[PDB]
Design a protein that fits this description.
The chain is α+β, with helices and mostly antiparallel strands and about 190 residues long. Helix content is about 55%, strand content about 10%. The PDB classes it as oxidoreductase.
Length: about 190
């Protein structure tokens, strides 16, 4: 076939019921994740090719960057709760990997302040139990698929994208192959 299990994707030996349609995992410490976000715009090109009715979900993970890794998972919960993902994603990536000016929770907080979220609103969210349960959801989704690496994308809790099996001579061709694969799996 043109798309083969173990080639552009793998199948989960243990499917996950009720899982989000398109589920993406990343870390602000993850170097290919930085690429996926600022150079390749994966999420965005996937969305452009997905059918109507398909919602897209993105979660942060704890297993990179120790203590700061966890703070970032909680900050991402804050970003999701306030709906400000598109304003903090780039400065968080660059603060962690480019300028290396993010070293503590207070530095993460600064990124949100500079993006215009109010201190009082940020700290309230940070400490809220809605954000607690959003952190729980991120952890549970990752646990469900025994996730040990990022970036990762899962389709309907049963297929996992395998970018290692796609040409990388051309960044544009890679992205389209990736997005077309998500669509194919989506229609499966």
């Amino acid at each position: 076939a043109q798309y083969e299990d173990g080639k552009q994707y793998t199948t989960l030996e243990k499917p996950v019921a009720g899982a989000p349609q398109v589920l993406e995992f990343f870390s602000f410490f993850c170097p290919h994740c930085y690429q996926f976000e600022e150079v390749l715009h994966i999420s965005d090109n996937v969305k452009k090719k997905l059918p109507e009715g398909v919602k897209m979900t993105k979660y942060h993970v704890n297993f990179m960057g120790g203590d700061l890794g966890k703070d970032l998972t909680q900050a991402w919960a804050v970003a999701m709760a306030l709906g400000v993902e598109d304003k903090v994603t780039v400065p968080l990536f660059e603060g962690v990997q480019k300028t290396q000016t993010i070293r503590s929770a207070s530095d993460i907080r600064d990124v949100f302040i500079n993006a215009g979220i109010k201190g009082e609103e940020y700290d309230a969210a940070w400490n809220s139990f809605v954000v607690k349960s959003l952190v729980a959801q991120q952890e549970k989704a990752a646990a469900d698929v025994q996730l040990r690496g990022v970036p990762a994308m899962f389709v309907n809790g049963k297929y996992q994208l395998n970018p290692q099996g796609m040409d990388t001579s051309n960044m544009d061709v890679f992205v389209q192959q990736y997005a077309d694969t998500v669509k194919y799996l989506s229609e499966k």
